[PDB]
Write a protein that binds this ligand. Structure first.
Ligand SMILES: [Ca+2]
Ligand SMILES: [Ca+2]
Ligand SMILES: [Ca+2]
Ligand SMILES: [Ca+2]
Ligand SMILES: [Ca+2]
Ligand SMILES: [Ca+2]
Ligand SMILES: [Hg+2]
Ligand SMILES: [Hg+2]
Lengths: 211, 211
């Protein structure tokens, strides 16, 4: 039988690239010709994978995309020169492994929230959220951390609020909200993967100060 | 025989993680017990890879790091309950695949250069350099793009210099350099992987205007 095969997405260099060599024992009693079927082979997407009919070498012809197709299920066939299948079709599972090629994406471009000016420091205000198309199950490529990039106006001073880097919940950090002088605040928030050390994106959070 | 084995670095989840099942046809004649040898198995680093003596499942016991060890070479053994090896040791090559977990780093914290004030626009001044520890052969995780982040001072005007994104060579972009007015310039340069779209780092290029 053939064991599982893995290939990293976004591979660069020259193609095609060798994956594994399929071989039938009957090769010693007859000339055998190899073929593959399945989505990724003879079915759309066609030709992503190919196999040399005489050598039995399975190959990949282009860079892969885990976010497009993360797993291919193919079937190899072995037929003798006489026209008879010398083996029962063998299943081949090709797993596409992940690369951090997607920046997180906030669920909204502008999040809205409000807070009473007398709110004691530590009061939760609102929550922002971002997703990441990468592999959050097997890697850290989609492990998001939230941070506040800027505040406008920066009065009475900067850091009027803060954000929980895990939950995206924004809270009152200090006292001093003054609806009369600074009615609203526009915060630029950031979401970055690799636990905050990777790719990032930003969005806005507009907070209205109530009485 | 065993096909190539690959495993991505920095994997998360519960360990051990299955890789492949090894079996001996000799089991038909007697009970067989499997084991592995090699650096990464019984020899340092000990226990990175283990094998179930009865089922033959080769497993990985911890997250790997391509920048430390990118390839392991082990050997599987198959011994009968009577004490006789029923197969010759089989070589297993385990390839560690890359993840973009290293940001580029400039070869110097501050690069120094000089240029005569009469220099015509388009004159090469100096060069800045950065390296990236990731896989530059199989991925774009180490493909660097250079850019200028800021210019101090921003006089006589902004864009006095420019940098080739591929080579890192800094050139005179516009005319107006005069040491009598502004003798030195401090540029913040940035190097980012994934061809400029990934992880980034910065440094400074100090340029001195001469007569
Ligand atoms: Ca992708
Ligand atoms: Ca990806
Ligand atoms: Ca990501
Ligand atoms: Ca590493
Ligand atoms: Ca890198
Ligand atoms: Ca790496
Ligand atoms: Hg591959
Ligand atoms: Hg693995």
């Amino acid at each position: 039988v053939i064991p599982p095969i893995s290939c990293p997405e976004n591979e660069k260099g020259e193609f095609p690239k060798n994956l594994v060599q399929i071989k039938s024992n009957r090769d010693k009693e007859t000339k055998v010709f190899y073929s593959i079927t399945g989505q990724g082979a003879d079915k759309p997407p066609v030709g992503v994978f190919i196999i040399e009919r005489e050598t039995g070498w399975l190959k990949v012809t282009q860079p892969l995309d885990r976010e497009a197709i993360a797993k291919y299920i193919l079937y190899s066939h072995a037929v003798s020169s006489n026209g008879e299948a010398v083996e029962d079709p063998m299943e081949i599972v090709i797993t596409v492994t992940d690369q951090n090629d997607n920046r997180p994406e906030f669920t909204q471009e502008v999040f809205e929230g409000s807070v009473a000016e007398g709110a004691v420091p530590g009061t939760s205000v609102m929550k922002v959220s971002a997703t990441d198309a990468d592999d959050d199950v097997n890697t850290y490529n989609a492990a998001i951390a939230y941070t506040i990039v800027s505040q406008d106006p920066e009065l009475p001073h900067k850091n009027m609020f803060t954000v929980n880097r895990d939950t995206g919940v924004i809270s009152v950090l200090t006292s001093g909200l003054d609806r009369e002088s600074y009615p609203t605040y526009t915060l630029v928030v950031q979401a970055a993967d690799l636990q905050g050390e990777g790719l990032s994106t930003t969005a806005k959070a507009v907070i209205t100060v109530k009485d």
